[model samples]
Target: APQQINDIVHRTITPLIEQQKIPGMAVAVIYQGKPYYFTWGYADIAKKQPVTQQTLFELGSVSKTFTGVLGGDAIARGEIKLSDPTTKYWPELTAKQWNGITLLHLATYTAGGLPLQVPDEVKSSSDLLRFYQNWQPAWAPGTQRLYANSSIGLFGALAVKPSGLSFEQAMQTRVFQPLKLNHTWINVPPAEEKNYAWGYREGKAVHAAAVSPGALDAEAYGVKSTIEDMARWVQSNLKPLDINEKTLQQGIQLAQSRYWQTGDMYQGLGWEMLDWPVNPDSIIALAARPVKAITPPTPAVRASWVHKTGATGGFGSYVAFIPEKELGIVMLANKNYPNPARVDAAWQILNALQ
Candidate 1:
């Protein structure tokens, strides 16, 4: 059976390396609550550095999932409720037209149709405020599901406000330390700098990340991590576990429990639930082409499989799991690839696993 899974990955993923779709990758498979690791190609292609469990890749938008969990944790602690309006935290940050916007709106990207990004020129809080003041949404909250980082970026900071910790500090004290996710970070420590894997695009090297606490979408695309650390995260979510003297069971439940049926794909807190057995291309191409049959789907309903795919600059990452089967997989690569390809690769493996 182990060999069977191994064959599936090699058969499915190896070609990406052979074709230079990715210069390097670190993938981990979680079977029955344990992790099995694999590495392919190079971390530093020029020097032929092998990608290993220690190799860190930018998580890109997958970092939103961290905010999702952290927000849920804060919610469970009664620090903040999803229904609270944005003005509760920063009154002047929103326009009068956005009065109905709530924390949940930002968390779910339903806040008056926030776009995939906030402009780089709109670099300061005042700038974002002015942008929001002038911007108008075509869709209101609970209307359409649009993909966005502006939403995640704003929610990440608000979620931690009650905890009195900066976003990075909270990640370390509340999450990384508890899960022993020593290899995960927005800031890679100086001692472990070599572990970072740079990224490439179109066969040319590109910087892996652009992050700043001041940036509006920083948390939306800033996390860096390894397969080794991701496995622990995947495992805990698969079978509820205790960490840092506090059981994350409630937080995990709250985060993954909600779903908004967008199109062929579903949106959970920060993850996307793909309708399994559905065509990968059709699913989010299925997603990109929304049928608009419904707005926000009901909470607590389950999907066959859930995944989050991420790409920024040159790094690409995909994470997915089936709660019913308690099986999970993570694919982290140092080059950007098409989203459809990501779905096809993982679906083929998961399809085979079943």
Candidate 2:
């Protein structure tokens, strides 16, 4: 007889595909330090490639987890301090207000106010410096909540500078090599081109685009990895090694601690803190009821789960873990489906696991 856990996931996800019209998906669930993996649908509709554990998918913003790890490793090496001002490393900037912003602020998405996306005008490091030099803050540093990729992306570059290596090189040295994550690559090396999974847009797999030289945003969202490799990466998070406990705690704290509270969303370092009702039945009832008000939960009620979602032109992904329960879930796909479906489906799958 099939395991009840496996059956629950299978039944929950099957309807999700039919309802959302997703082309392909790869999911991995980590329970008690063991992974249960599954894949359904196609990697390439034209080439008839079946979605498999080895199929690589662009991680989208989930790539930020790698960046956060790099930052944590740098801190462990005494190369940088999270509390140091952002201006300390990149002093070419002329913004007076930005001088007060710390690397911690950037990592926590609480750096005054930074845009979610880097402007097209920012084409290189020099362009980034000019943008900051002329930048003006809409709020005081550490004041408001605005989820900005530009803020975290720049922080990734700052993290690399202190390590005396490019962000890509540092990721390879600190993370990929230690974990032996074969398919994970920040800037996919040319040799691995054969295994690269092209992203789908509008129901068609699009060719990979050439990364612009010296682009930092690439560090934030450019990682590519197979579902198998991501499972290993999640295992590392669940079971860390060769990384200092202090630094790891700090990194997880930055990633998990609530840094800012939006209307109904609480922003942490790279994850979102949800305030689901403690009573499982109550949570289900509240989630099902349609309410016009968008109110965030109190601090006491908001620590049930830690989650992060990522989306790009052709990829959608999510990772959530319950520390108390010692369980985690990951979902990755190579299609351009809406981001909410990824979260919704993952939650349903997680709910069924219980």
Candidate 3:
């Protein structure tokens, strides 16, 4: 890595650790297929445990990128078609208007209009179906952009069921093993509980909290992993495996393409494209919007970065990359800093790199 890039990583991360008063943070920067890994602060503040590459932290919505990867894997194996109606796997959905929604619509956030998060009235996967059954969409599918977790979560479940495996199992078989990532898991097993980072809430009042536990959201926001594992995942995304050539190509094409043009953001498979004016060729960022806040700032130019942000109960993460520059950055934090400004911080770092 260039000395300037190294400086950028250290300089940017060091203060974030202090400002957030976070226990610890892990960051991985990939440039031209080479990775520079950094970790600082504590994985457990109460225990005074130092954060390391191996220390696991919740990935939050970064899990959606993994879901998109697995969805591509399924496409490669012919387990499911992106354009196929979700009802094919769960026929019971026929009673609802959801029968008309396709996997593509779900991935692109264009499924029969719903908000960013599943409503409080719906609790589990079954509840999601029932809600969709009775719900009516004000806008036609693919016409307007609305970020809906219910649709994406259902797509995740569909990806697993059609493959005759659970979401966790399918991910391991399709993406994890191939990438050699052992620390990433949809559900953190109790056996490896020693290194888990405690989640937190930051404000005038700070309190530690455990990450959310459940399977339905796993597809959209249910992954916990360490910096080391994320490094590998980042490398794979920067330079995908030959075994996944076709699938990876499809994912990149879908994710980079404009599937739906939202008011300010362009929606892709599971990514959002941001066209920043300052340094268009210098950086490209892609991210999933937080469930609570769906829209992001409108860039001044066409778009230079692809960006995604993921947040769960106690975790929040941002991953962005500039393909033209062959550079990618992963930011993982233990605290539940719900503000999207964290993403703004990542963008500032990218700009500084220029």
Candidate 4:
């Protein structure tokens, strides 16, 4: 609202679009429990259509936060237990390491030694079982956190087993449909596919198949959403009581629950947490943590801001919220840009409102 801060947001992002790093972006910001939306550049460069509140772009890894929320929903319904060993659900895994790995470990990327992506040979559920059976963890579970998509993907597959639905349907029945996120999905419905923005680089159309049929990546990077739908999501994190859905509220609490903490960064089921009023040093330090590394040393329980950044082959996104202030933001871009610029843009708006 202040002229000085308005200038800050422009100064932070205007140059990126001008320089062509981000082809187009639709952004949502929530302050004091109110949602605000903004747009820049084009949703479809070929058609010259401007980005809008309804235009869809890949939310990418932010999809993990959705999985985290759904996982909580399953837990609330007694479909799964946070402490239950994953092997309990997938007994065919038959791996000693799988017995030691709990549902929470996979959700938090603490499934020791699991990498970010599954190997090509692990082609299907049956193949995945054999992979796990032969695989050995680099470290014991619950000792440290590693950022791994395979871990989340594995959790997602096991998560839907109890519900007797495909992973896609589980997300719909347990999370999206219940929360009324009409424009958010892993697979865009045919009728609405026209609203889906693909990618562009160097002023040419580019294809990004981050999610394909039957691929586990859906648990990590398959989500695409519009600012219109995500504004509701940010609110669910900041003010779930307004939703008036008890199951949704419980799931959000668990989704944003802190699982690992070190310095300025804290890992939740999906979202990352850090003390509010973040600085450049904090962001840099947070990025420096090991990709698959540290057990907890009695992480302090504390209040923190919830945040997550996502990207796919063609799109980049950033979302964050501060519950104490009832403030949140979602930044979705058609072209892939670095996270620092996205963070810089959102941080400016958040700090200004603060």
lDDT comparing candidate 3 with the true structure: 0.68
Better of 2 and 4 by TM-score: 4
Query: Which candidate comes out best when scored by TM-score?
Result: 1
Which lDDT values do the candidates have, in the order given?
0.76, 0.69, 0.68, 0.76
lDDT of 3 at 131: 69
Question: Measured by TM-score, how close is model 1 to the native structure?
Answer: 0.91
lDDT of 2 by residue, 227-274 (tens): 888877776665453344455544544455454565455555456666
The segments of candidate 2 whose C-alpha lies over 4 angstroms from its true place after superposition are 241-254, 261-266, 275-304
Task: Using lDDT as the measure, name the better of candidate 1 and candidate 2.
Answer: 1
Which stretches of model 4 miss by more than 4 angstroms?
Answer: 1-8, 201-204, 210-214, 284-303
lDDT (10s digit) by residue, model 1, range 1-354: 389888998898888667656789888888766788889887887877889889989888888878787887788888888889888987776567778888887888777677777776786767877776787777667666677777778888888888898888877776678778888988777887798887887777666544765565456888899899998888766665444445355666666765566556666678666554556566542122232423344443334577788887888898888877777899999998877777778778877876
TM-score of 3: 0.83
| Cα lDDT of model 3 by residue, 1-354, tens digit | 588877887777777777777667888887666778888776787778887888888877777878877886677668888779878877877765676678877886776576566665565667766766677776666565566676677677787676788787888877787677888887778987888877766532232233231325777777888877887776665444233557654544444555555445566556666554434333212233322223332221224466678776667788877655556788887776744557656766777764
lDDT of 3 at 312: 64
Q: lDDT by residue for model 4 over 1-354, one digit each (tens)?
A: 445545656676687677656778877778777777778988888788888888988887888889888887788778899789988888787766776789988988877868767776666666766667787888788776667888888888787788899888888877788778888878778998788887776567765564643357887778888998898888877875566667767777777766666666877767788776667457632122343233432232234567889877778889988887777888889888888877777777777777
Candidate 3 clash figure, as a count:
16
